[PDB]
From a paper:
During the early steps of HIV infection, IN catalyzes the initial covalent attachment of the viral cDNA to host cell nuclear DNA. The catalytic core domain (residues 50–212) adopts an RNase H superfamily fold and contains a D,D-35-E motif that binds Mg2+ or Mn2+ ions, which mediate DNA cleaving and joining. IN function is assisted by the cellular cofactor lens epithelium-derived growth factor (LEDGF/p75), which binds tightly to a site at the catalytic core domain dimer interface. An additional class of IN inhibitors, the allosteric inhibitors of integrase (ALLINIs), act at a second site on HIV IN.
To investigate the mechanism of GSK002 resistance further, we determined three high-resolution crystal structures, one of GSK002 bound to catalytic core domain-only, one of GSK002 bound to the catalytic core domain containing the Ala124 substitution, and one of GSK002 bound to the catalytic core domain with Thr125. These two substitutions were chosen for study because they were the most influential in reducing GSK002 IC50 in the study of diverse HIV isolates. A model predicting GSK002 activity using the top four most influential amino acid substitutions (K20R, A124N, T125X, where X ≠ T, and K188R) performed well under cross validation, where the cross-validated mean-squared error decreased from 8.49 to 2.26. The protein structures were quite similar, with RMSDs ranging from 0.09 to 0.13 Å in pairwise comparisons. However, the azaindole core of the bound GSK002 ligand is seen to shift in position by ~0.5 Å, depending on the identity of the substitutions at residue 125, along with movement of the difluorobenzyl group by almost 1 Å. Substitutions at residue 124 could affect ALLINI binding or the catalytic core domain–CTD interaction. Substitutions at 125 may also affect ALLINI binding. Overlay of the catalytic core domain•GSK002 structures on the IN•GSK1264 structure suggests a further mechanism of resistance. Larger substitutions at residue 124 and 125 would create a steric clash with the polypeptide backbone of the IN CTD, disrupting the inhibitor-mediated interaction. Thus, the larger side chains in the resistance substitutions appear to either clash directly with the IN CTD or displace the bound inhibitor sufficiently to result in an inhibitor clash with the CTD.
Numbering used by the authors:
A (entry chain A), B (entry chain A): 56 to 137, 149 to 188, 193 to 209
The structure:
């Protein structure tokens, strides 16, 4: 897929919200545990994401997620416009379950699962693929 | 410099704490506004960082930052061992000052400054250099 496309969705676990961003072309994930599912939290997440990777386009399974003025302002400022994703989210949810008792806080288990997911060789890992896709696109 | 070396330090602004991670070889920055300067916050930041980039070694200007059991546990689990940095932190502090009135929250201004810093061409940007350094190291 195009190297600037990311998918963002929230999932719920233990009464908390996990914002999951998938780089569609590599399967690479960025995730954070947010206090609430709000436009301000999504906007802040998008600003962080766009400063770290070249974010061109964002996709989601819940269109209404992107209607706040806060989200529209983040996309405006950062210059963002509006199978794999289902699979990557499924893998992450499974990994969180597998490491959950190794940590007190869900947020810690989430970051351990992101780490495991991005480094797992499938033969390259999602972390290796994103860096290869973005470097070759710059070239 | 070696591609797995990162420098982590905290700086203070408006009574808040900004954790700044610099990828020494590229000048690329990752930053977060943390509620307090604690071992638990540093450990959590390191886990997130290590799941996104291949973190081999961490440097700091304040050695005591890395003594908590929480930090030692994050480095153990993620397999981490213990001019440019001064310049990158200086540039970020200047950029935050330059964009500060464009946002209500300091954390928003911080992420705008990270974005500006990583995308600025110096001729490649810090964001372009990190992806090139890591991709060629995998190759
Ligand atoms: C806190 C916050 N609110 C925002 C927005 C945007 C709309 N609103 C709603 C609103 C409503 C009434 C107002 F009087 C008012 F001033 C803003 C940004 C925001 C979001 C993204 C963003 C920018 C802004 C200002 C500036 C350029 C980079 O991208 C904010 C913002 O905070 C979050 C990122 C946490 C949402 C902020 O700190 O100002
Ligand atoms: C909350 C937290 N505390 C930690 C630690 C480690 C030591 N301590 C102190 C402590 C003291 C007394 C205990 F009875 C006790 F159980 C742990 C991790 C932590 C930090 C990093 C880390 C791991 C753990 C458990 C597991 C493998 C991946 O890396 C935590 C941890 O929370 C933060 C990351 C926010 C610090 C957690 O959720 O358990
Ligand atoms: C992306 As959900 C709020
Ligand atoms: C609002 As988004 C593109
Ligand atoms: C890195 As400072 C706490
Ligand atoms: C504790 As760190 C290397």
């Amino acid at each position: 897929c195009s190297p600037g496309i990311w998918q963002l969705d929230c999932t719920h676990l233990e009464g908390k919200v996990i914002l999951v961003a998938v780089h569609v072309a590599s399967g690479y994930i960025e995730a954070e545990v947010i206090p609430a599912e709000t436009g301000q939290e999504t906007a802040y997440f998008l600003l962080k994401l766009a400063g770290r990777w070249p974010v061109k386009t964002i996709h989601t399974d819940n269109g209404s997620n992107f209607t706040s003025n806060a989200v529209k302002a983040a996309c405006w400022w950062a210059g963002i416009k509006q199978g794999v994703v289902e699979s990557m989210n499924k893998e992450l949810k499974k990994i969180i379950g597998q490491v959950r008792d190794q940590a007190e806080h869900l947020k810690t288990a989430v970051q351990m699962a992101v780490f495991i997911h991005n480094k797992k060789r499938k033969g390259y890992s999602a972390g290796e693929r994103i860096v290869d896709i973005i470097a070759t696109d710059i070239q």
